[PDB]
Amino acid sequence: GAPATVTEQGEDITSKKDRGVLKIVKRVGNGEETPMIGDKVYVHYKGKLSNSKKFDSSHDRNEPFVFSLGKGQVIKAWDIGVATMKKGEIAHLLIKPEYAYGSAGSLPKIPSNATLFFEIELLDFKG
Numbered sequence: 001g002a003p004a005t006v007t008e009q010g011e012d013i014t015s016k017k018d019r020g021v022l023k024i025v026k027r028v029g030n031g032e033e034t035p036m037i038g039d040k041v042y043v044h045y046k047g048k049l050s051n052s053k054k055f056d057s058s059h060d061r062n063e064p065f066v067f068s069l070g071k072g073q074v075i076k077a078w079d080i081g082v083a084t085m086k087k088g089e090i091a092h093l094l095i096k097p098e099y100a101y102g103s104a105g106s107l108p109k110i111p112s113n114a115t116l117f118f119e120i121e122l123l124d125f126k127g
């Protein structure tokens with residue numbers, strides 16, 4: 001399935017090159033620009049655990065998720081991954097716990113030492 005593919009075929013997008021965040025582009029976005037620190041970013045996403053459980057989805061809420069890029073409002077892998085995305089891009093991320101919730105997890109939804117899969121669609125961003 002998709003998590004397998006990004007695990008096996010994804011690009012390491014970390015600056016450390018520690019394979020902690022892997023990415024594949026599912027839909028190529030529009031224009032070369034990518035969001036920058038402080039930008040208000042609007043996305044749709046779905047997140048799955050390594051047992052296939054879908055732990056969250058913005059689509060299921062009929063409204064996007066909004067955050068300010070690069071400010072630590074989200075897990076590290078999102079600040080890193082979303083910074084790579086073009087407007088309209090759909091990407092998959094496969095994230096080791098060091099770039100997500102670590103050994104603590106985030107109860108009740110995210111267990112300890114959880115590798116996370118996301119599909120993210122970047123709808124828009126603005127300074």
Ligand SMILES: O=C1[C@@H]2CCC[C@H]([C@@H](CO)CN1Cc1ccccn1)N2S(=O)(=O)c1cc(Cl)cc(Cl)c1
Pocket residue numbers: 047055056065073074075078106107109110
């Ligand atoms: O950094 C996050 C990441 C990535 C952005 C989308 C969501 C938001 C919105 O739920 C939560 N956060 C930030 C955050 C804030 C507070 C506690 C834990 N995490 N998540 S998430 O992994 O899908 C998530 C979804 C849900 Cl329902 C619960 C948790 Cl603990 C985490």
